[PDB]
Coordinates of C-alpha atoms in Angstrom, one line a residue:
Chain A
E201 CA 111.3 111.0 -33.9
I202 CA 113.9 112.4 -36.2
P203 CA 113.6 112.0 -39.9
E204 CA 117.1 110.5 -41.3
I205 CA 117.1 111.0 -45.2
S206 CA 120.0 109.6 -47.2
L207 CA 121.8 111.8 -49.8
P208 CA 121.1 110.0 -53.4
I209 CA 124.0 110.8 -55.8
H210 CA 123.4 110.4 -59.6
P211 CA 123.4 106.7 -60.7
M212 CA 125.9 107.1 -63.3
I213 CA 128.2 108.2 -60.9
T214 CA 127.6 105.1 -58.8
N215 CA 128.2 103.0 -61.8
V216 CA 131.8 104.6 -62.1
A217 CA 132.4 104.2 -58.5
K218 CA 131.4 100.7 -59.1
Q219 CA 133.8 100.0 -62.0
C220 CA 136.4 101.6 -59.9
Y221 CA 135.1 99.2 -57.0
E222 CA 135.6 96.2 -59.1
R223 CA 139.4 97.1 -59.4
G224 CA 140.1 98.6 -55.9
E225 CA 140.9 102.1 -57.4
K226 CA 140.0 105.3 -55.6
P227 CA 137.4 106.8 -58.1
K228 CA 139.1 110.3 -59.5
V229 CA 137.4 113.4 -60.4
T230 CA 138.8 113.5 -64.0
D231 CA 137.4 109.7 -64.6
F232 CA 134.6 111.4 -66.4
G233 CA 137.2 113.2 -68.4
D234 CA 135.0 115.6 -71.0
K235 CA 132.2 114.8 -69.0
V236 CA 133.4 117.2 -66.2
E237 CA 133.2 120.4 -68.1
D238 CA 129.8 119.9 -69.7
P239 CA 126.4 121.5 -69.0
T240 CA 123.8 119.2 -68.3
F241 CA 126.1 117.2 -66.2
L242 CA 127.1 119.9 -63.7
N243 CA 123.4 120.6 -64.1
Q244 CA 122.3 117.5 -62.7
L245 CA 124.9 117.6 -60.0
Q246 CA 123.8 120.8 -58.8
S247 CA 120.3 119.6 -58.7
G248 CA 121.1 116.7 -56.5
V249 CA 123.4 119.0 -54.3
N250 CA 120.6 121.2 -53.9
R251 CA 118.0 118.6 -53.1
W252 CA 120.6 117.5 -50.4
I253 CA 120.7 121.0 -48.9
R254 CA 116.9 120.9 -48.7
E255 CA 116.9 117.5 -47.0
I256 CA 119.5 118.8 -44.3
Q257 CA 117.7 122.1 -43.5
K258 CA 114.6 120.2 -43.0
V259 CA 115.5 118.7 -39.9
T260 CA 118.4 121.2 -38.6
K261 CA 116.3 123.9 -38.3
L262 CA 113.2 121.5 -36.6
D263 CA 111.9 122.7 -33.5
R264 CA 108.6 122.4 -31.3
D265 CA 107.0 123.8 -28.3
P266 CA 109.6 123.4 -25.2
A267 CA 106.7 122.3 -22.6
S268 CA 104.8 120.2 -25.2
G269 CA 105.1 116.6 -23.7
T270 CA 106.5 115.5 -20.7
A271 CA 109.8 116.6 -19.2
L272 CA 111.8 113.4 -20.3
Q273 CA 110.1 113.9 -24.1
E274 CA 111.8 117.3 -24.4
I275 CA 115.1 116.3 -22.7
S276 CA 115.0 113.1 -24.9
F277 CA 114.4 115.2 -28.1
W278 CA 117.2 117.5 -27.5
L279 CA 119.1 114.5 -27.4
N280 CA 117.8 112.9 -30.5
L281 CA 118.9 116.1 -32.1
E282 CA 122.5 115.9 -31.0
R283 CA 122.8 112.2 -32.4
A284 CA 120.9 113.0 -35.5
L285 CA 122.9 116.1 -36.4
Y286 CA 126.1 113.7 -35.7
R287 CA 124.7 111.4 -38.5
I288 CA 124.0 114.1 -40.9
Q289 CA 127.8 115.1 -40.6
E290 CA 128.3 111.2 -41.1
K291 CA 126.8 111.6 -44.5
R292 CA 128.2 114.7 -45.1
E293 CA 131.6 113.1 -44.8
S294 CA 131.1 110.3 -46.9
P295 CA 133.7 110.3 -50.1
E296 CA 130.9 110.0 -52.4
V297 CA 129.5 112.9 -51.5
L298 CA 133.1 114.5 -51.3
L299 CA 133.2 113.3 -54.9
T300 CA 130.3 115.1 -56.3
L301 CA 131.5 118.3 -54.4
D302 CA 135.2 117.6 -56.3
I303 CA 133.3 117.3 -59.6
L304 CA 131.5 120.9 -58.7
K305 CA 134.8 122.2 -57.6
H306 CA 137.1 121.1 -60.6
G307 CA 134.2 122.3 -63.0
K308 CA 134.9 125.9 -61.5
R309 CA 131.4 125.9 -60.0
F310 CA 131.6 127.3 -56.6
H311 CA 127.9 127.8 -55.8
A312 CA 127.1 124.4 -54.7
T313 CA 130.2 123.8 -53.0
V314 CA 130.2 126.7 -50.6
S315 CA 126.7 126.4 -50.2
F316 CA 127.1 122.9 -48.7
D317 CA 128.8 124.3 -45.9
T318 CA 127.3 127.7 -45.5
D319 CA 123.3 127.4 -47.0
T320 CA 123.4 124.2 -45.0
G321 CA 122.6 125.4 -41.3
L322 CA 124.3 121.9 -40.3
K323 CA 127.6 123.8 -38.8
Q324 CA 125.7 126.2 -36.5
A325 CA 123.4 123.3 -35.5
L326 CA 126.3 121.1 -34.8
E327 CA 128.3 123.9 -32.9
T328 CA 125.1 124.6 -30.6
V329 CA 124.6 120.9 -30.3
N330 CA 128.1 120.3 -29.0
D331 CA 127.4 123.3 -26.5
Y332 CA 124.6 121.3 -25.0
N333 CA 126.2 117.7 -25.8
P334 CA 127.5 117.4 -22.5
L335 CA 124.4 118.8 -20.6
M336 CA 122.3 116.5 -22.3
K337 CA 124.5 113.3 -21.2
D338 CA 124.1 111.6 -18.2
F339 CA 120.7 113.4 -16.9
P340 CA 119.7 112.3 -13.3
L341 CA 115.9 112.1 -14.2
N342 CA 115.9 108.4 -13.3
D343 CA 116.8 109.6 -9.8
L344 CA 113.3 111.4 -10.0
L345 CA 111.8 108.2 -11.7
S346 CA 111.9 105.5 -9.2
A347 CA 111.8 107.8 -6.3
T348 CA 108.7 107.0 -3.9
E349 CA 110.0 108.3 -0.5
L350 CA 110.1 112.3 0.0
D351 CA 113.6 111.8 1.1
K352 CA 114.6 110.4 -2.0
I353 CA 112.7 112.9 -3.8
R354 CA 114.7 115.9 -1.5
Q355 CA 118.3 114.5 -2.4
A356 CA 117.0 113.9 -6.0
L357 CA 115.9 117.2 -6.6
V358 CA 119.1 118.9 -5.2
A359 CA 121.1 116.2 -7.3
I360 CA 119.3 117.2 -10.3
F361 CA 119.7 120.7 -10.2
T362 CA 122.9 120.7 -9.1
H363 CA 123.7 118.7 -12.3
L364 CA 122.0 121.4 -14.1
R365 CA 124.0 123.9 -12.6
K366 CA 126.4 123.7 -15.7
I367 CA 124.0 126.1 -17.6
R368 CA 126.2 129.3 -16.5
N369 CA 128.9 128.0 -19.5
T370 CA 126.4 126.9 -22.0
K371 CA 124.1 129.9 -22.7
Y372 CA 120.7 128.8 -21.3
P373 CA 117.8 130.7 -22.6
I374 CA 115.3 132.3 -20.0
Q375 CA 111.9 130.9 -21.3
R376 CA 113.3 127.7 -22.2
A377 CA 114.5 127.4 -18.6
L378 CA 111.2 128.2 -17.3
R379 CA 109.3 126.0 -19.3
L380 CA 112.1 122.9 -18.3
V381 CA 111.3 123.9 -14.6
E382 CA 107.5 123.6 -15.2
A383 CA 108.2 120.3 -16.9
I384 CA 110.3 119.2 -13.7
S385 CA 107.4 120.3 -11.6
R386 CA 105.2 118.2 -14.0
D387 CA 107.2 114.9 -13.3
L388 CA 107.2 115.9 -9.5
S389 CA 103.4 116.1 -9.4
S390 CA 102.9 113.0 -11.5
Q391 CA 105.0 111.0 -9.0
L392 CA 103.5 112.6 -5.9
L393 CA 100.2 111.7 -7.5
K394 CA 100.9 107.9 -7.6
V395 CA 102.6 108.6 -4.1
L396 CA 99.6 109.6 -2.7
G397 CA 97.9 106.8 -4.6
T398 CA 100.1 104.3 -2.9
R399 CA 99.9 105.9 0.6
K400 CA 96.3 105.1 1.5
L401 CA 96.5 108.3 3.6
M402 CA 92.7 108.5 3.9
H403 CA 92.9 106.1 6.6
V404 CA 96.3 106.5 8.7
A405 CA 96.5 108.3 12.2
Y406 CA 97.8 111.7 12.5
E407 CA 100.9 110.6 13.9
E408 CA 102.0 108.9 10.6
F409 CA 99.9 111.3 8.4
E410 CA 101.7 113.9 10.3
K411 CA 105.2 112.6 9.4
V412 CA 104.1 112.0 5.7
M413 CA 103.0 115.8 6.0
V414 CA 106.2 117.3 7.2
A415 CA 107.9 115.2 4.3
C416 CA 105.9 116.9 1.7
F417 CA 106.8 120.2 3.3
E418 CA 110.3 118.9 3.3
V419 CA 110.1 118.3 -0.7
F420 CA 108.4 121.6 -1.0
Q421 CA 111.1 123.5 0.8
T422 CA 113.9 122.2 -1.0
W423 CA 112.2 123.3 -4.3
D424 CA 111.8 126.6 -3.1
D425 CA 114.9 127.4 -1.6
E426 CA 117.0 125.4 -4.3
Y427 CA 115.0 127.0 -6.8
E428 CA 115.8 130.6 -5.5
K429 CA 119.4 129.7 -5.8
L430 CA 118.5 128.6 -9.3
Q431 CA 116.9 131.7 -9.4
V432 CA 120.0 134.0 -8.4
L433 CA 122.2 131.5 -10.8
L434 CA 120.2 132.4 -13.7
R435 CA 120.4 136.2 -12.5
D436 CA 124.0 136.2 -12.7
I437 CA 124.3 134.5 -16.1
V438 CA 121.9 137.0 -17.5
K439 CA 124.6 139.6 -16.0
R440 CA 127.5 138.3 -17.3
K441 CA 126.1 137.8 -20.5
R442 CA 124.7 141.4 -21.0
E443 CA 121.8 141.1 -23.8
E444 CA 118.9 143.0 -23.2
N445 CA 116.0 144.3 -20.8
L446 CA 113.4 141.6 -21.8
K447 CA 110.1 141.5 -20.0
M448 CA 111.0 137.8 -18.6
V449 CA 108.5 136.2 -16.7
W450 CA 109.3 134.6 -13.3
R451 CA 105.4 134.5 -12.3
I452 CA 105.8 130.8 -12.4
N453 CA 102.9 128.8 -11.2
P454 CA 104.2 125.0 -11.5
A455 CA 102.6 121.8 -11.3
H456 CA 103.0 121.6 -7.2
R457 CA 101.3 124.3 -5.6
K458 CA 98.2 123.3 -6.8
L459 CA 98.2 120.4 -4.2
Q460 CA 100.0 122.5 -1.8
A461 CA 97.2 124.7 -1.3
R462 CA 94.6 121.7 -0.4
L463 CA 97.4 120.6 1.8
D464 CA 97.0 123.8 3.6
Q465 CA 93.5 124.2 3.8
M466 CA 93.7 120.5 5.5
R467 CA 96.0 121.8 7.9
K468 CA 93.6 124.1 9.3
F469 CA 90.9 121.4 8.7
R470 CA 92.9 118.8 11.2
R471 CA 93.1 122.2 13.4
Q472 CA 89.3 121.6 13.8
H473 CA 89.6 118.1 14.3
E474 CA 92.4 118.2 16.5
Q475 CA 90.9 120.6 19.2
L476 CA 87.6 118.6 18.9
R477 CA 88.4 115.0 18.5
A478 CA 91.2 115.5 20.8
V479 CA 89.3 116.7 23.8
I480 CA 85.4 116.2 23.0
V481 CA 85.8 112.6 24.3
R482 CA 85.8 114.1 27.7
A517 CA 75.8 115.2 26.3
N518 CA 76.0 113.3 22.8
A519 CA 77.8 116.2 21.2
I520 CA 81.0 114.1 21.4
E521 CA 79.8 111.2 19.3
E522 CA 77.5 113.4 17.1
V523 CA 80.2 115.7 15.8
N524 CA 82.2 112.7 15.3
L525 CA 79.6 111.1 13.7
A526 CA 78.6 114.4 11.3
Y527 CA 82.2 114.8 11.1
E528 CA 83.0 111.6 9.3
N529 CA 79.8 111.6 7.4
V530 CA 80.6 115.1 5.7
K531 CA 84.1 113.9 5.1
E532 CA 84.5 110.0 4.3
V533 CA 84.2 110.8 0.2
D534 CA 87.5 112.7 -0.5
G535 CA 88.0 110.5 -3.9
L536 CA 91.7 110.4 -4.5
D537 CA 91.5 114.2 -3.7
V538 CA 91.9 115.4 -7.0
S539 CA 91.7 119.3 -7.7
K540 CA 89.0 119.7 -10.4
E541 CA 86.4 117.7 -8.3
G542 CA 88.1 119.3 -5.0
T543 CA 86.6 122.8 -5.9
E544 CA 83.9 121.6 -8.2
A545 CA 81.9 119.8 -5.3
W546 CA 84.2 120.1 -2.2
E547 CA 83.8 123.7 -1.6
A548 CA 80.1 123.5 -0.8
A549 CA 81.0 119.6 1.1
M550 CA 83.9 121.6 2.6
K551 CA 82.1 124.7 4.1
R552 CA 79.4 122.0 4.6
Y553 CA 81.2 120.1 6.8
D554 CA 82.2 123.2 8.6
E555 CA 78.4 124.2 8.9
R556 CA 77.8 120.7 10.2
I557 CA 80.1 120.9 13.0
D558 CA 78.7 124.4 13.6
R559 CA 74.9 123.7 13.4
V560 CA 76.0 120.2 15.6
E561 CA 78.1 122.4 17.8
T562 CA 75.8 125.3 18.0
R563 CA 73.7 123.4 20.9
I564 CA 76.9 123.5 23.3
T565 CA 77.6 127.2 23.3
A566 CA 74.1 128.0 24.5
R567 CA 73.9 124.7 26.4
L568 CA 77.2 125.4 28.3
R569 CA 75.2 128.6 28.9
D570 CA 72.8 126.1 30.7
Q571 CA 75.4 123.7 32.0
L572 CA 76.8 126.6 33.9
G573 CA 74.9 129.5 34.3
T574 CA 71.8 128.1 36.1
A575 CA 74.1 127.6 39.4
Chain B
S2 CA 129.0 178.9 -8.0
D3 CA 126.4 178.4 -10.7
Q4 CA 127.1 182.0 -11.8
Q5 CA 130.7 180.8 -12.3
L6 CA 129.7 178.0 -14.7
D7 CA 127.7 180.3 -16.6
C8 CA 130.4 182.7 -17.2
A9 CA 132.9 179.9 -17.6
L10 CA 130.8 178.5 -20.5
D11 CA 130.5 182.1 -22.1
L12 CA 134.4 182.1 -21.9
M13 CA 134.7 178.7 -23.5
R14 CA 132.2 180.1 -26.2
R15 CA 134.6 183.3 -26.8
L16 CA 137.7 181.1 -26.3
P17 CA 140.0 180.9 -29.5
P18 CA 139.5 177.5 -31.3
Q19 CA 143.2 176.8 -31.6
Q20 CA 144.2 175.5 -28.2
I21 CA 140.6 174.3 -26.6
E22 CA 142.3 171.3 -25.4
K23 CA 144.8 173.2 -23.4
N24 CA 142.7 176.1 -22.5
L25 CA 139.9 173.7 -21.3
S26 CA 142.4 171.9 -19.0
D27 CA 143.3 175.4 -17.7
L28 CA 140.0 176.1 -16.9
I29 CA 139.5 172.9 -15.3
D30 CA 142.5 174.0 -13.1
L31 CA 140.7 176.6 -11.8
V32 CA 137.9 174.7 -10.3
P33 CA 138.6 171.3 -10.6
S34 CA 135.8 170.3 -8.5
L35 CA 133.5 171.7 -11.5
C36 CA 135.8 169.6 -14.1
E37 CA 133.6 166.7 -15.0
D38 CA 130.8 169.3 -15.4
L39 CA 132.2 171.3 -18.3
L40 CA 133.3 167.9 -20.3
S41 CA 129.7 167.6 -21.1
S42 CA 128.9 170.7 -23.1
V43 CA 132.4 171.8 -24.2
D44 CA 133.0 171.1 -27.4
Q45 CA 136.9 170.0 -28.1
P46 CA 138.7 167.7 -30.6
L47 CA 138.7 163.9 -30.6
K48 CA 141.5 161.7 -29.5
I49 CA 142.3 158.7 -31.9
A50 CA 142.9 155.3 -30.3
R51 CA 144.7 152.4 -31.6
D52 CA 143.0 149.0 -31.9
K53 CA 146.1 146.6 -31.6
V54 CA 144.5 143.4 -32.6
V55 CA 142.8 144.7 -35.6
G56 CA 144.9 147.3 -37.1
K57 CA 142.4 150.0 -37.2
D58 CA 141.5 153.4 -35.4
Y59 CA 138.9 154.2 -33.5
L60 CA 138.0 157.7 -31.7
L61 CA 137.1 158.6 -28.3
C62 CA 134.4 160.3 -26.6
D63 CA 132.0 159.6 -23.5
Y64 CA 130.0 157.1 -25.3
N65 CA 132.8 154.9 -25.9
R66 CA 134.3 155.9 -22.5
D67 CA 133.2 152.6 -20.6
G68 CA 134.4 153.3 -17.2
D69 CA 137.7 154.7 -18.0
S70 CA 138.2 152.2 -21.2
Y71 CA 137.1 152.6 -24.6
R72 CA 135.2 150.1 -26.5
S73 CA 137.0 149.6 -29.7
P74 CA 134.3 148.8 -32.4
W75 CA 136.4 147.0 -34.6
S76 CA 137.2 144.5 -31.5
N77 CA 134.5 145.4 -29.0
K78 CA 137.4 145.3 -26.5
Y79 CA 138.5 147.9 -23.8
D80 CA 141.4 149.9 -23.4
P81 CA 142.5 150.3 -20.6
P82 CA 141.9 146.6 -19.9
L83 CA 138.9 146.7 -18.1
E84 CA 137.0 143.3 -18.4
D85 CA 134.2 144.8 -16.5
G86 CA 132.6 147.2 -18.9
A87 CA 129.2 147.6 -20.4
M88 CA 129.2 145.5 -23.5
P89 CA 126.5 146.5 -26.1
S90 CA 123.9 143.9 -27.1
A91 CA 124.8 141.4 -29.2
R92 CA 122.0 142.3 -31.5
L93 CA 123.4 145.8 -31.2
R94 CA 126.9 144.8 -31.9
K95 CA 126.1 143.4 -35.1
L96 CA 124.3 146.3 -36.1
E97 CA 127.3 148.5 -34.8
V98 CA 129.6 146.5 -36.9
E99 CA 128.0 147.3 -39.9
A100 CA 127.5 150.7 -38.8
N101 CA 131.1 150.9 -38.7
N102 CA 130.8 149.8 -42.0
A103 CA 128.6 151.9 -43.6
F104 CA 130.2 155.1 -42.1
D105 CA 133.5 153.7 -43.5
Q106 CA 132.0 154.2 -46.7
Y107 CA 130.4 157.4 -46.1
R108 CA 133.7 158.5 -44.5
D109 CA 135.6 157.5 -47.7
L110 CA 133.2 159.0 -50.0
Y111 CA 133.0 162.5 -48.7
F112 CA 136.3 162.7 -46.6
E113 CA 138.4 160.4 -48.9
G114 CA 140.6 159.3 -45.7
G115 CA 140.3 160.4 -42.3
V116 CA 139.0 158.3 -39.2
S117 CA 135.5 157.4 -38.1
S118 CA 133.6 155.5 -35.5
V119 CA 130.1 154.7 -34.5
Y120 CA 129.0 153.4 -31.1
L121 CA 125.9 152.2 -30.0
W122 CA 123.7 151.9 -26.8
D123 CA 120.0 151.3 -26.1
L124 CA 116.9 153.1 -25.4
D125 CA 113.4 151.1 -24.1
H126 CA 111.7 151.9 -27.5
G127 CA 114.6 152.0 -29.5
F128 CA 118.5 152.5 -29.4
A129 CA 121.2 155.5 -29.8
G130 CA 124.2 156.0 -31.2
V131 CA 126.8 158.5 -31.6
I132 CA 128.9 159.2 -35.0
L133 CA 132.4 160.3 -34.7
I134 CA 134.2 161.6 -37.9
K135 CA 138.0 163.3 -37.5
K136 CA 139.7 164.4 -40.9
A137 CA 142.8 166.1 -40.2
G138 CA 143.9 167.8 -43.4
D139 CA 146.6 166.6 -46.0
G140 CA 149.9 166.8 -43.9
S141 CA 151.7 166.6 -47.4
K142 CA 149.7 169.6 -48.5
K143 CA 150.0 172.9 -46.7
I144 CA 146.4 173.3 -46.1
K145 CA 146.4 172.8 -42.5
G146 CA 142.8 171.6 -41.8
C147 CA 141.0 169.2 -39.1
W148 CA 137.4 168.6 -39.8
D149 CA 135.7 167.2 -36.7
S150 CA 132.3 165.9 -36.5
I151 CA 130.1 164.2 -33.7
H152 CA 126.7 163.3 -34.5
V153 CA 124.3 162.2 -31.7
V154 CA 121.7 160.3 -32.8
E155 CA 118.8 158.9 -31.0
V156 CA 116.3 156.3 -32.6
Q157 CA 113.1 156.8 -30.6
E158 CA 111.4 153.7 -32.7
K159 CA 107.4 153.4 -32.4
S160 CA 105.3 150.3 -31.5
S161 CA 105.4 148.2 -34.5
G162 CA 104.9 148.7 -38.2
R163 CA 108.5 149.9 -38.4
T164 CA 108.0 153.4 -38.5
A165 CA 110.5 155.2 -36.5
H166 CA 111.4 158.8 -34.6
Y167 CA 115.0 159.5 -35.6
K168 CA 116.2 162.4 -33.2
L169 CA 119.8 163.7 -34.3
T170 CA 122.0 166.4 -32.8
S171 CA 125.5 167.2 -34.8
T172 CA 128.7 169.2 -34.2
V173 CA 131.4 170.2 -36.5
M174 CA 134.6 171.6 -35.5
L175 CA 136.3 173.1 -38.3
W176 CA 139.9 174.0 -38.5
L177 CA 141.7 175.7 -41.3
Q178 CA 144.9 177.3 -42.5
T179 CA 146.7 178.4 -45.9
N180 CA 150.0 179.7 -46.0
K181 CA 149.4 181.3 -49.5
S182 CA 151.5 184.2 -50.9
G183 CA 148.4 186.8 -51.2
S184 CA 147.3 186.3 -47.5
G185 CA 150.5 185.2 -45.8
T186 CA 149.0 182.8 -43.3
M187 CA 144.9 182.9 -43.3
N188 CA 144.0 180.7 -39.9
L189 CA 140.2 179.9 -39.7
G190 CA 138.7 178.5 -36.8
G191 CA 135.1 177.7 -36.4
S192 CA 132.3 175.4 -35.0
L193 CA 128.6 174.6 -35.5
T194 CA 125.9 172.5 -34.1
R195 CA 122.2 171.6 -35.3
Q196 CA 119.4 169.3 -34.7
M197 CA 116.9 167.6 -36.5
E198 CA 114.4 164.9 -36.4
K199 CA 112.4 162.9 -38.9
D200 CA 110.1 160.0 -38.8
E201 CA 111.1 157.9 -41.9
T202 CA 109.5 154.6 -42.5
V203 CA 111.5 151.7 -41.8
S204 CA 111.6 148.6 -43.9
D205 CA 113.6 145.8 -45.0
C206 CA 115.0 147.9 -47.7
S207 CA 114.9 150.8 -45.4
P208 CA 116.5 150.0 -42.4
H209 CA 117.2 152.5 -39.4
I210 CA 120.9 152.6 -40.2
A211 CA 119.9 153.8 -43.9
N212 CA 117.6 156.5 -42.5
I213 CA 120.5 157.6 -40.1
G214 CA 122.9 157.4 -42.9
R215 CA 120.5 160.0 -45.0
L216 CA 120.1 162.1 -41.7
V217 CA 123.9 162.4 -41.1
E218 CA 124.6 162.8 -45.1
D219 CA 121.8 165.8 -45.3
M220 CA 122.9 167.3 -42.0
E221 CA 126.8 167.5 -42.7
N222 CA 125.8 168.8 -46.4
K223 CA 123.8 171.6 -44.6
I224 CA 126.4 172.7 -42.1
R225 CA 129.4 172.5 -44.5
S226 CA 127.2 174.3 -46.9
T227 CA 125.9 176.5 -44.3
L228 CA 129.0 177.5 -43.0
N229 CA 131.0 178.3 -46.2
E230 CA 128.3 180.6 -47.5
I231 CA 126.7 182.2 -44.2
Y232 CA 129.2 182.4 -42.0
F233 CA 132.5 182.5 -44.1
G234 CA 130.8 185.1 -46.3
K235 CA 129.8 187.1 -43.1
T236 CA 133.5 187.2 -42.2
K237 CA 134.3 188.3 -45.8
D238 CA 131.8 190.9 -45.5
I239 CA 133.1 192.0 -42.2
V240 CA 136.9 192.2 -43.5
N241 CA 135.3 194.3 -46.5
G242 CA 133.0 196.6 -44.2
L243 CA 136.0 197.2 -42.1
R244 CA 138.3 198.8 -44.8
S245 CA 137.3 199.5 -48.3
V246 CA 139.3 199.2 -51.4
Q247 CA 138.0 201.9 -53.1
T248 CA 139.2 205.1 -52.5
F249 CA 136.7 207.7 -50.3
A250 CA 135.0 210.8 -52.0
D251 CA 134.6 208.3 -55.0
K252 CA 132.8 206.2 -52.6
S253 CA 130.9 209.3 -52.1
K254 CA 130.4 209.9 -55.7
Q255 CA 129.0 206.3 -55.7
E256 CA 126.8 206.7 -52.3
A257 CA 126.0 210.1 -53.4
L258 CA 124.1 208.9 -56.3
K259 CA 123.2 206.1 -54.3
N260 CA 121.2 208.1 -52.1
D261 CA 119.9 210.0 -55.0
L262 CA 118.5 206.9 -56.3
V263 CA 117.2 206.2 -52.7
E264 CA 115.4 209.4 -53.3
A265 CA 114.3 208.1 -56.6
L266 CA 112.6 204.8 -55.4
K267 CA 111.4 206.6 -52.4
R268 CA 110.2 209.4 -54.4
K269 CA 107.3 207.7 -57.0
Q270 CA 106.0 205.7 -53.8

């Protein structure tokens, strides 16, 4: 994912260092002698160093959309940049490259020498890399990877955010942190999607489903209160930094409320089925409403959101209307059942 | 006690500009409940601070008065040691250090010495700064002068396109003396204040700071000029109008013929 391009040197210099390598002598700067203070020689040297500066700048200033790809991709991308910039420092610190720099310094040409460290943004890139270097090492995303139980997710979410708490000392950006949070919610949603897949939730009783329901809201509340603690955390961070009055968007619509709202509609849905199926058992309206009940509800189909609204808003209010029309008789029937006497 | 405040400002208006600091403290010693109500529109000289870590100088006013400390633009530190002050924007800190640099150049070109300072602060659609310049006279020379300048500038940047609205308010608090044999001692106080606003286009070759530099330059040229001719010539006119050098009855002759020509000019109407 990161281009690591070597720095090519002029071949004659390699032959000179090769001649010194046959002996074991350190290839000196004045080995060229008269060739040092010549025009075409220094001309080609600056050409090579100039292309080196472009090779360094090719990857140091590189940047992509912080929300592009999944969470692990962006996090791993920052890690890749850290080790890659260290490899650029490795190519910078070799004695052969330093030998070329010594040629340009000994030849009184300060341009490529000073620009080799200033024009290259490697120094500032490495210092920002080092500022984010402990923050990127030992990231507990694997705690979120193999977490299928909601309790594991509760403790995992709190653990990851407490490890992320070290962004008060490393200047974390605003929008970067918000896209980071949405990436965290992306993986949370993915894990929950397969969790609902391996749950077979459309066949269990309301006891187990109630426990799973409460556990889902447990995870959601860990998200809300700990996210507000992270909010206050970033609030005091922006206060201690004292930079400006930007229009920072905190109107975050993450990847988990999308399922949370559907859950809420199902809560009141189970209230209808709770009062009915829990009592109705107590003339065929009993059976008939369970008949029409299951008949308009047995096809949730992996309960995704898109088809959820797309067809289930009609099938949903249609289930309500099937109760109603089915349950329409009982009202006036009750008016019969007891008003006659 | 609002009329008391109006008469107090008029008293400072007519107060001798030699003891502005002492008499301002005295007037505050009358009604100290109205103290930091007067230290907003009563012009007084500046205060020279001392940046210890850098080895420079920086003036003191209310804009650098962060809490009760002063933000040394040569170091961006507060003195007294208040680690809780209102730091400027890092963006504006870079803009401020180059501002201090450009005005050191300005000060060196016109004043050939002296102390200067340029602080900055925000605005929703722009920013605003102050420019302090204090040039005391050549201590070696006998001319005991003290130029004092304060330039309240407010950059009201427009939407985009890099065109702005530069509002500027200045103040010069002059001071002069000569111990010349022909005059004995000729003390000379004085103070001015003006306002100007222009909408010069911002560009990569014309930054905001350059526009401010042109405005401060033009403003001080106008104030120094305006002073020298209008006000100081007015004082020379007053001394000449009080006592004349020519003997009277000679002036009656010249004024006699003057009135004769007055009749001659208003004769062929």
